Design a protein around this nucleic acid. Structure first.
Ligand SMILES: [K+]
Ligand SMILES: [K+]
Ligand SMILES: [Mg+2]
Ligand SMILES: [Mg+2]
Ligand SMILES: [Mg+2]
Ligand SMILES: [Mg+2]
Ligand SMILES: [Zn+2]
Ligand SMILES: [Zn+2]
Ligand SMILES: [Zn+2]
Lengths: 101, 56, 118, 105
RNA sequence: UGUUGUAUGAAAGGAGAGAAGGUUAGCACUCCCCUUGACAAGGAUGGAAGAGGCCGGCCU
RNA sequence: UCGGCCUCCGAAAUAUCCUUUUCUAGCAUGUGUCAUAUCCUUAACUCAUUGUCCCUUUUUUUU
RNA sequence: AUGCCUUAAACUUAUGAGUAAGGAAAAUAACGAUUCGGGGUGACGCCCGAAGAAUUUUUGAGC
């Protein structure tokens, strides 16, 4: 179900060896993880191109503008800002709370 | 998925794009008339229905 | 698990003169008395209770002796609960094996009868 | 048992009653719980075979089907001399199992 | 005035039937066969090999 | 006014190969620590149970 | 370590419910407030409490 520490380590190494089109081979290494869960974990969180840094001022401005533009469409928005859609979503909610004060 | 190979010489790349386009036409036309045969009832083989579903 | 092996091997060879191996293995079992984990702690105590019936109460008392009055309670209560096991199982045989404690100023501690000479 | 630290023996002065073991407990030693080398017969104290309880299992308490023995190693260490070896409290493990099955079933 | 001019199947004794986690589906490229009236189809996908350079070995 | 379709065989499934005999076939020659998950491990650890709870209402089976 | 077909498979990569007890890492919380009394400990740990103008030079005894 949830992702342990050691499971993430196995998943990173296995993607580094087998690439990104063989999730059935990668699922065989883990315990009780299916191929779809492995893929989802990689793109959501474990991929190195995911940027886990603080938000710049520019990146926030684009967030607020695009969220006005296409409301609730975070998969469309998210590659324009270059964050994960979940990241974009929670940071939007952060700024909305902050503007409420 | 977009295919680019950065180093590759342009005679070789032109030849590859030529022959991939030829295979694509052969593939797609076969998809086109095997669907017609499946709809009219001419095929009875199940593996050709699976292959056409995949191509489609 | 090695202490469990010592317990069971100890009781099998009782009466057969294999005490040198068992005393050798006591030299390895005995530093594990300060372990605190309960599974390991009860395997060690089982090994010592097996060894009491194979190499005798005298050896087991000779091991305990120095720590029964040791300054730290840690060493002391572990040592006292080995002593009690020897005492329960072999209370009568220990009469011959106690050390000689000297008399202090107001209390007498020498067992004078054993000191009798015929 | 040796596997349950919270279980407690009766340890009263044992009598002429012979302790018995239910099918589940058949062939094992009452003290150290072993399957091999039976040396002596188990005697239970008067209170523990009072009345309806006459003839139940020593170790668990179910209908007894054969006699209980001490093993050879408990005889040599004279563990057979400590008292009535009837277990007098169910303990946490038995109780937990009941409530767990009853929750489910 | 003899002898290695070879093969098939069976029995006995051994080995054990492709897929970079497991269970498997096949169609071919070369050359080696078997069943077959075959320009068909099967025989484990029929079986067996499969990157480059230098003299079985060495280097990427 | 009439109106009468077919009938079955094998293969794609229980491999293949090696060694020694047996049967037969075919040939060919020769002037540290607080507070949190997790991982690993230990104990021949267990797989439900039926064993008067009868206690309670001014409450009591009628010649 | 060989090319192709529906990434060849529109196949699966399973592992129940609990009892008692350990080991290892990840994560995470703090650094010098000095001495005295008390708690504690084999001993420390730890815990509870308390508190540049003054005789040899440059801020004059000089007038
Ligand atoms: K072939
Ligand atoms: K096959
Ligand atoms: Mg073929
Ligand atoms: Mg097959
Ligand atoms: Mg086949
Ligand atoms: Mg075929
Ligand atoms: Zn029983
Ligand atoms: Zn026993
Ligand atoms: Zn009793």
């Amino acid at each position: 179900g949830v992702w342990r520490n050691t499971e993430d380590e196995i998943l990173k190494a296995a993607v580094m060896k087998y690439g990104k089109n063989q999730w059935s081979r990668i699922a065989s290494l883990l315990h009780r993880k299916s191929a779809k869960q492995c893929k989802a974990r990689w793109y959501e969180w474990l991929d190195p191109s995911i940027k886990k840094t603080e938000w710049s001022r520019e990146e926030e401005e684009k967030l607020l503008h695009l969220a006005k533009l296409m409301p609730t469409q975070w998969r469309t928005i998210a590659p324009i800002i270059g964050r994960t859609a979940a990241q974009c979503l929670e940071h939007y909610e952060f700024l909305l709370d902050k503007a409420a004060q | 998925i977009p295919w680019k190979v950065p180093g590759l010489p342009t005679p070789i790349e032109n030849m590859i794009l030529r022959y991939v386009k030829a295979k694509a036409d052969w593939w797609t036309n076969t998809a086109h008339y095997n669907r017609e045969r499946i709809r009219r009832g001419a095929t009875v083989d199940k593996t050709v229905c699976k292959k056409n579903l995949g191509r489609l | 698990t090695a202490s469990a092996v010592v317990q069971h091997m100890s009781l099998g060879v009782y009466g057969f003169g294999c005490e040198d191996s068992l005393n050798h293995l006591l030299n390895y079992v005995w530093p594990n008395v300060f372990e605190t984990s309960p599974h390991v702690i009860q395997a060690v105590m089982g090994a010592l209770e097996g060894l009491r019936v194979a190499i005798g109460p005298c050896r087991m008392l000779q091991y305990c002796l120095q720590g029964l009055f040791h300054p730290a309670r840690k060493v002391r209560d572990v040592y006292w609960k080995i002593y009690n096991s020897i005492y329960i199982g072999s209370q009568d045989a220990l009469i011959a094996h106690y050390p000689r404690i000297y008399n202090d100023d107001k209390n007498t501690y020498i067992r004078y009868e054993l000191d009798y000479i015929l | 048992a040796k596997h349950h630290p919270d279980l407690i023996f009766c340890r009263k002065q044992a009598g002429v009653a012979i302790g018995r073991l239910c099918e589940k407990c058949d062939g094992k030693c009452v003290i150290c719980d072993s399957y091999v080398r039976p040396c002596t017969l188990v005697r239970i104290c008067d209170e523990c075979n009072y009345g309806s309880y006459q003839g139940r299992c020593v170790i668990c308490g179910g209908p007894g089907v054969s006699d209980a023995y001490y093993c050879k190693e408990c005889t040599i260490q004279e563990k057979d001399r400590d008292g009535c070896p009837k277990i007098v409290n169910l303990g946490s493990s038995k109780t937990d199992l009941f409530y767990e099955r009853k929750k489910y079933g």
